[PDB]
Amino acid sequence: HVGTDDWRCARSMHEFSAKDIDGHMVNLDKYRGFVCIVTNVASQCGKTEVNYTQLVDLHARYAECGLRILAFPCNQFGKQEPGSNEEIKEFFAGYNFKGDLFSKICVNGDDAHPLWKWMKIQPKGKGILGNAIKWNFTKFLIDKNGCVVKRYGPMEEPLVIEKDLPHYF
């Protein structure tokens, strides 16, 4: 396990922990064996409707194959996630989201959650024109061993990921 001070030494998502939307600390080692889409989310974004509905559909169709969705609210892009964790939970419930919802974090800057600092420097987690998260709804695909295998930008709808999933199931 690694923390905010030694995140660069991690070799896997599984070495991290994060508070869920209810305030409870979750050890991400629980995702061993599962293929995960890790994404930064926001309620008041033009991308919100398509991304949430397609993530719900992917989770519904592939949950039994091993797909998990880890949703990290983040208010750093246009202040498009201004609400409380309680409000965000209720917003997600309106989509019938059964994935895993975490407490609001930062994804860029010195205060970014260590998992996001680590994802951004992985060989398959590098961005276009620098590694910073560019907007809400960046997606990292994580394999069963906790390694980053692909990064998709804000404009790549979750259904684009579907063709890449079977290889990891």
XYZ file of N, CA and C in Angstrom:
507
model
N 0.830 -1.203 0.000
C 0.000 0.000 0.000
C 0.869 1.259 0.000
N 0.427 2.286 -0.734
C 1.128 3.559 -0.825
C 0.156 4.683 -0.483
N 0.725 5.837 -0.130
C -0.057 6.996 0.253
C 0.275 8.248 -0.536
N -0.072 9.415 0.021
C 0.156 10.681 -0.675
C 1.640 10.977 -0.859
N 2.503 10.405 -0.023
C 3.919 10.731 -0.091
C 4.742 9.776 -0.949
N 4.292 8.540 -1.183
C 5.099 7.613 -1.973
C 4.309 7.018 -3.131
N 3.364 7.780 -3.694
C 2.517 7.240 -4.754
C 3.325 6.804 -5.970
N 4.489 7.414 -6.213
C 5.290 7.034 -7.374
C 5.881 5.640 -7.257
N 5.944 5.087 -6.052
C 6.473 3.741 -5.899
C 5.443 2.659 -6.200
N 4.166 3.009 -6.343
C 3.151 1.996 -6.582
C 3.328 1.346 -7.946
N 2.941 0.077 -8.022
C 2.926 -0.661 -9.271
C 1.519 -1.024 -9.724
N 0.489 -0.629 -8.974
C -0.873 -1.075 -9.237
C -1.876 -0.147 -8.558
N -3.029 0.035 -9.216
C -4.203 0.579 -8.548
C -4.444 -0.039 -7.179
N -4.192 -1.347 -7.065
C -4.541 -2.089 -5.857
C -3.803 -1.592 -4.624
N -2.783 -0.767 -4.801
C -1.993 -0.263 -3.693
C -2.591 0.992 -3.074
N -3.719 1.482 -3.595
C -4.314 2.741 -3.170
C -5.607 2.519 -2.392
N -6.035 3.568 -1.685
C -7.314 3.588 -0.988
C -7.988 4.929 -1.230
N -9.319 4.954 -1.121
C -10.050 6.195 -1.340
C -11.380 6.140 -0.601
N -11.825 7.301 -0.106
C -13.109 7.379 0.587
C -14.263 7.290 -0.398
N -15.221 6.415 -0.107
C -16.415 6.351 -0.938
C -17.304 7.559 -0.657
N -18.428 7.635 -1.381
C -19.300 8.804 -1.314
C -19.880 8.999 0.080
N -19.922 7.941 0.888
C -20.470 7.995 2.236
C -19.423 8.352 3.285
N -18.165 8.502 2.889
C -17.103 8.819 3.819
C -16.299 7.632 4.294
N -16.599 6.431 3.812
C -15.929 5.222 4.265
C -14.710 4.923 3.399
N -13.575 4.660 4.050
C -12.340 4.369 3.334
C -12.415 3.001 2.660
N -12.094 2.963 1.369
C -12.151 1.751 0.558
C -10.738 1.383 0.123
N -10.329 0.139 0.377
C -9.050 -0.359 -0.123
C -9.249 -0.867 -1.545
N -8.562 -0.239 -2.510
C -8.798 -0.574 -3.911
C -8.199 -1.915 -4.299
N -7.499 -2.581 -3.374
C -7.140 -3.981 -3.570
C -8.363 -4.875 -3.796
N -9.555 -4.440 -3.377
C -10.771 -5.226 -3.579
C -11.109 -5.423 -5.053
N -10.483 -4.662 -5.951
C -10.746 -4.757 -7.381
C -9.845 -5.756 -8.094
N -9.022 -6.506 -7.362
C -8.187 -7.514 -7.997
C -9.056 -8.534 -8.730
N -8.681 -8.860 -9.971
C -9.477 -9.722 -10.820
C -10.471 -9.019 -11.725
N -10.878 -7.798 -11.388
C -11.875 -7.047 -12.136
C -11.205 -6.055 -13.083
N -11.877 -5.809 -14.206
C -11.501 -4.772 -15.160
C -12.266 -3.507 -14.794
N -11.559 -2.383 -14.635
C -12.184 -1.181 -14.091
C -12.087 -0.021 -15.073
N -13.159 0.750 -15.155
C -13.135 2.063 -15.783
C -13.124 3.074 -14.643
N -12.016 3.797 -14.505
C -11.855 4.835 -13.486
C -12.050 6.181 -14.177
N -13.001 6.994 -13.704
C -13.347 8.225 -14.420
C -13.647 9.363 -13.451
N -13.241 10.581 -13.824
C -13.605 11.769 -13.060
C -14.918 12.330 -13.598
N -15.860 12.607 -12.701
C -17.224 12.915 -13.114
C -17.623 14.299 -12.601
N -18.754 14.786 -13.115
C -19.335 16.074 -12.763
C -20.808 16.031 -13.155
N -21.649 16.722 -12.378
C -23.096 16.719 -12.627
C -23.533 17.754 -13.658
N -22.831 18.877 -13.747
C -23.294 20.001 -14.548
C -22.430 20.206 -15.779
N -22.161 19.125 -16.492
C -21.308 19.148 -17.664
C -22.127 18.742 -18.881
N -21.800 19.322 -20.034
C -22.491 18.905 -21.245
C -22.281 17.443 -21.591
N -21.219 16.831 -21.064
C -20.921 15.422 -21.286
C -21.626 14.502 -20.295
N -22.261 15.062 -19.259
C -22.767 14.259 -18.148
C -23.793 13.233 -18.609
N -24.806 13.665 -19.370
C -25.907 12.763 -19.694
C -25.405 11.551 -20.472
N -24.613 11.780 -21.525
C -24.153 10.665 -22.348
C -23.197 9.771 -21.565
N -22.336 10.358 -20.736
C -21.349 9.522 -20.066
C -21.997 8.674 -18.987
N -22.875 9.271 -18.179
C -23.493 8.495 -17.111
C -24.387 7.408 -17.695
N -25.185 7.737 -18.721
C -26.095 6.716 -19.247
C -25.323 5.578 -19.913
N -24.226 5.889 -20.599
C -23.463 4.822 -21.232
C -22.657 4.011 -20.222
N -22.161 4.634 -19.142
C -21.499 3.863 -18.088
C -22.481 2.922 -17.396
N -23.705 3.391 -17.140
C -24.719 2.519 -16.545
C -25.009 1.337 -17.467
N -25.120 1.597 -18.772
C -25.398 0.529 -19.722
C -24.235 -0.461 -19.794
N -22.993 0.035 -19.813
C -21.854 -0.881 -19.858
C -21.786 -1.731 -18.601
N -22.023 -1.117 -17.449
C -21.975 -1.857 -16.199
C -23.064 -2.914 -16.169
N -24.270 -2.550 -16.602
C -25.358 -3.519 -16.654
C -24.995 -4.712 -17.528
N -24.352 -4.472 -18.676
C -24.128 -5.571 -19.604
C -22.895 -6.395 -19.263
N -21.887 -5.809 -18.613
C -20.625 -6.512 -18.394
C -20.249 -6.737 -16.939
N -21.090 -6.332 -15.974
C -20.765 -6.529 -14.560
C -20.385 -7.974 -14.266
N -21.147 -8.927 -14.807
C -20.879 -10.337 -14.535
C -19.594 -10.815 -15.186
N -19.127 -10.124 -16.233
C -17.849 -10.460 -16.851
C -16.666 -9.928 -16.062
N -16.902 -9.011 -15.131
C -15.834 -8.432 -14.338
C -15.708 -6.922 -14.435
N -16.587 -6.210 -15.132
C -16.422 -4.767 -15.263
C -16.885 -4.074 -13.991
N -16.065 -3.159 -13.494
C -16.440 -2.276 -12.404
C -16.228 -0.833 -12.845
N -17.037 0.079 -12.313
C -16.915 1.505 -12.619
C -16.584 2.244 -11.331
N -15.501 3.023 -11.349
C -15.088 3.825 -10.202
C -15.244 5.292 -10.595
N -16.222 5.969 -10.004
C -16.563 7.343 -10.353
C -16.064 8.277 -9.260
N -15.165 9.197 -9.635
C -14.577 10.202 -8.756
C -15.095 11.596 -9.100
N -16.016 12.167 -8.318
C -16.450 13.545 -8.579
C -15.285 14.509 -8.414
N -15.291 15.559 -9.225
C -14.205 16.530 -9.224
C -14.764 17.857 -9.705
N -14.505 18.920 -8.943
C -15.032 20.244 -9.234
C -14.014 21.155 -9.925
N -12.933 20.601 -10.472
C -11.858 21.445 -10.982
C -12.085 21.964 -12.393
N -13.138 21.538 -13.088
C -13.332 21.888 -14.497
C -14.637 22.658 -14.663
N -14.526 23.983 -14.766
C -15.704 24.815 -14.911
C -16.611 24.844 -13.702
N -16.128 24.404 -12.537
C -16.948 24.290 -11.328
C -18.245 23.532 -11.616
N -18.112 22.410 -12.328
C -19.273 21.653 -12.776
C -19.663 20.521 -11.824
N -19.025 20.432 -10.663
C -19.441 19.530 -9.583
C -19.432 20.270 -8.248
N -20.289 21.287 -8.096
C -20.209 22.152 -6.909
C -20.870 21.590 -5.662
N -21.692 20.557 -5.782
C -22.517 20.128 -4.674
C -21.792 19.290 -3.645
N -22.522 18.982 -2.581
C -22.013 18.107 -1.541
C -22.003 16.659 -2.015
N -21.234 15.830 -1.301
C -21.200 14.402 -1.598
C -22.591 13.792 -1.497
N -23.390 14.266 -0.544
C -24.757 13.777 -0.399
C -25.602 14.109 -1.627
N -25.481 15.336 -2.139
C -26.195 15.733 -3.348
C -25.733 14.926 -4.554
N -24.427 14.697 -4.662
C -23.900 13.933 -5.791
C -24.427 12.503 -5.752
N -24.525 11.921 -4.556
C -25.089 10.581 -4.434
C -26.504 10.533 -4.993
N -27.314 11.539 -4.661
C -28.699 11.566 -5.118
C -28.764 11.775 -6.624
N -27.851 12.588 -7.158
C -27.779 12.783 -8.599
C -27.481 11.464 -9.299
N -26.466 10.735 -8.817
C -26.141 9.436 -9.403
C -27.298 8.455 -9.298
N -28.027 8.491 -8.185
C -29.149 7.574 -8.021
C -30.207 7.785 -9.101
N -30.350 9.021 -9.595
C -31.268 9.294 -10.689
C -30.914 8.580 -11.975
N -29.662 8.144 -12.125
C -29.272 7.373 -13.298
C -29.343 5.872 -13.060
N -29.782 5.439 -11.873
C -29.779 4.029 -11.489
C -28.353 3.472 -11.488
N -27.402 4.304 -11.094
C -26.001 3.894 -11.084
C -25.775 2.859 -9.986
N -25.239 1.698 -10.360
C -24.872 0.650 -9.413
C -23.368 0.501 -9.272
N -22.592 1.361 -9.926
C -21.148 1.314 -9.822
C -20.687 1.899 -8.507
N -19.389 2.135 -8.422
C -18.804 2.549 -7.161
C -18.513 4.045 -7.192
N -19.181 4.790 -6.313
C -19.114 6.244 -6.266
C -18.245 6.672 -5.092
N -17.290 7.554 -5.356
C -16.330 7.979 -4.346
C -16.579 9.433 -3.961
N -15.989 9.850 -2.842
C -16.093 11.241 -2.419
C -15.329 12.146 -3.383
N -15.750 13.418 -3.447
C -15.167 14.379 -4.384
C -13.683 14.594 -4.105
N -12.882 14.623 -5.175
C -11.432 14.768 -5.085
C -10.973 15.852 -6.056
N -9.680 16.170 -5.978
C -8.946 16.838 -7.045
C -8.213 15.783 -7.861
N -8.095 16.026 -9.169
C -7.371 15.126 -10.062
C -6.109 15.760 -10.641
N -5.965 17.078 -10.553
C -4.770 17.787 -10.975
C -4.209 18.586 -9.808
N -2.928 18.913 -9.905
C -2.311 19.759 -8.905
C -1.756 18.969 -7.749
N -1.127 19.710 -6.829
C -0.421 19.086 -5.713
C -1.367 18.345 -4.777
N -2.636 18.761 -4.724
C -3.649 18.172 -3.854
C -4.437 17.044 -4.527
N -4.066 16.644 -5.743
C -4.748 15.545 -6.411
C -4.662 14.273 -5.581
N -5.707 13.458 -5.668
C -5.675 12.167 -5.000
C -4.508 11.335 -5.534
N -3.774 10.626 -4.661
C -2.573 9.904 -5.124
C -2.848 8.908 -6.229
N -4.029 8.285 -6.253
C -4.326 7.367 -7.344
C -4.269 8.084 -8.681
N -4.809 9.305 -8.739
C -4.843 10.047 -9.993
C -3.460 10.554 -10.379
N -2.651 10.962 -9.398
C -1.258 11.275 -9.702
C -0.562 10.082 -10.345
N -0.798 8.877 -9.814
C -0.153 7.672 -10.330
C -0.685 7.273 -11.710
N -2.012 7.274 -11.904
C -2.556 6.926 -13.218
C -1.958 7.793 -14.330
N -1.791 9.089 -14.071
C -1.382 10.029 -15.115
C 0.051 9.818 -15.599
N 0.896 9.138 -14.820
C 2.292 8.891 -15.209
C 2.524 7.465 -15.696
N 1.483 6.641 -15.745
C 1.645 5.288 -16.246
C 1.928 5.321 -17.749
N 2.661 4.319 -18.271
C 2.999 4.319 -19.705
C 1.796 4.396 -20.630
N 0.696 3.719 -20.305
C -0.512 3.781 -21.117
C -1.503 4.816 -20.597
N -1.099 5.642 -19.632
C -1.969 6.657 -19.065
C -1.571 8.066 -19.462
N -0.740 8.193 -20.486
C -0.262 9.523 -20.814
C -1.226 10.210 -21.781
N -1.288 11.536 -21.671
C -2.282 12.320 -22.367
C -1.758 12.918 -23.666
N -2.643 13.666 -24.326
C -2.284 14.479 -25.485
C -1.807 15.830 -24.959
N -0.587 16.222 -25.328
C -0.052 17.537 -24.969
C 0.052 17.694 -23.452
N 0.715 16.732 -22.814
C 0.853 16.693 -21.372
C -0.108 15.697 -20.737
N 0.171 15.344 -19.477
C -0.580 14.281 -18.805
C -1.710 14.775 -17.915
N -1.825 16.083 -17.677
C -2.903 16.585 -16.834
C -4.265 16.153 -17.376
N -5.218 15.971 -16.461
C -6.606 15.750 -16.863
C -7.127 17.020 -17.524
N -7.745 16.876 -18.698
C -8.108 18.036 -19.507
C -9.510 18.553 -19.215
N -10.443 17.677 -18.857
C -11.802 18.090 -18.519
C -12.454 16.948 -17.744
N -13.695 17.176 -17.335
C -14.507 16.105 -16.774
C -14.598 14.942 -17.759
N -14.726 13.729 -17.205
C -14.977 12.483 -17.956
C -13.773 12.008 -18.777
N -12.580 12.150 -18.218
C -11.481 11.313 -18.674
C -11.682 9.914 -18.103
N -11.308 8.895 -18.875
C -11.461 7.496 -18.459
C -10.121 6.774 -18.529
N -9.778 6.048 -17.466
C -8.644 5.128 -17.467
C -9.182 3.709 -17.389
N -8.757 2.861 -18.317
C -9.066 1.432 -18.263
C -7.960 0.726 -17.490
N -8.360 -0.045 -16.475
C -7.477 -0.716 -15.525
C -7.698 -2.218 -15.683
N -6.620 -2.984 -15.849
C -6.809 -4.417 -16.045
C -6.937 -5.129 -14.697
N -7.058 -6.461 -14.759
C -7.309 -7.254 -13.562
C -6.173 -7.172 -12.550
N -4.966 -6.791 -12.983
C -3.827 -6.627 -12.086
C -3.659 -5.208 -11.567
N -4.580 -4.303 -11.884
C -4.472 -2.938 -11.418
C -3.607 -2.031 -12.261
N -3.200 -2.464 -13.449
C -2.381 -1.645 -14.334
C -3.244 -0.831 -15.289
N -2.799 0.394 -15.577
C -3.442 1.220 -16.599
C -3.126 0.635 -17.969
N -4.159 0.340 -18.752
C -3.946 -0.190 -20.089
C -4.395 0.765 -21.188
N -5.221 1.764 -20.882
C -5.623 2.738 -21.888
C -6.214 3.948 -21.173
N -6.131 5.096 -21.844
C -6.699 6.359 -21.389
C -7.563 6.902 -22.513
N -8.764 7.367 -22.173
C -9.704 7.940 -23.127
C -10.059 9.350 -22.681
N -10.111 10.280 -23.627
C -10.340 11.672 -23.285
C -11.799 12.009 -23.046
N -12.027 13.246 -22.584
C -13.400 13.698 -22.309
C -14.361 13.527 -23.464
N -13.894 13.607 -24.705
C -14.789 13.532 -25.850
C -15.028 12.109 -26.325
N -14.375 11.118 -25.718
C -14.531 9.727 -26.126
C -15.652 9.119 -25.279
N -16.801 8.834 -25.913
C -17.963 8.327 -25.206
C -17.642 6.945 -24.632
N -18.210 6.596 -23.473
C -17.881 5.288 -22.880
C -18.084 4.111 -23.826
N -19.038 4.181 -24.759
C -19.233 3.069 -25.689
C -18.016 2.831 -26.584
N -17.146 3.833 -26.775
C -15.884 3.614 -27.492
C -15.009 2.591 -26.776
N -15.122 2.515 -25.447
C -14.321 1.598 -24.641
C -14.773 0.162 -24.855
N -16.032 -0.031 -25.259
C -16.618 -1.370 -25.273
C -15.806 -2.335 -26.136
N -15.342 -1.888 -27.305
C -14.587 -2.776 -28.183
C -13.260 -3.225 -27.581
N -12.727 -2.490 -26.605
C -11.467 -2.827 -25.960
C -11.640 -3.732 -24.745
N -12.869 -3.931 -24.277
C -13.085 -4.656 -23.027
C -12.849 -6.163 -23.144
N -13.334 -6.847 -24.200
C -13.238 -8.319 -24.207
C -11.844 -8.842 -23.972
N -10.823 -8.142 -24.475
C -9.455 -8.608 -24.318
C -9.063 -8.753 -22.852
N -9.686 -7.985 -21.966
C -9.326 -7.974 -20.556
C -10.263 -8.808 -19.684
N -11.318 -9.377 -20.260
C -12.243 -10.247 -19.531
C -11.755 -11.693 -19.537
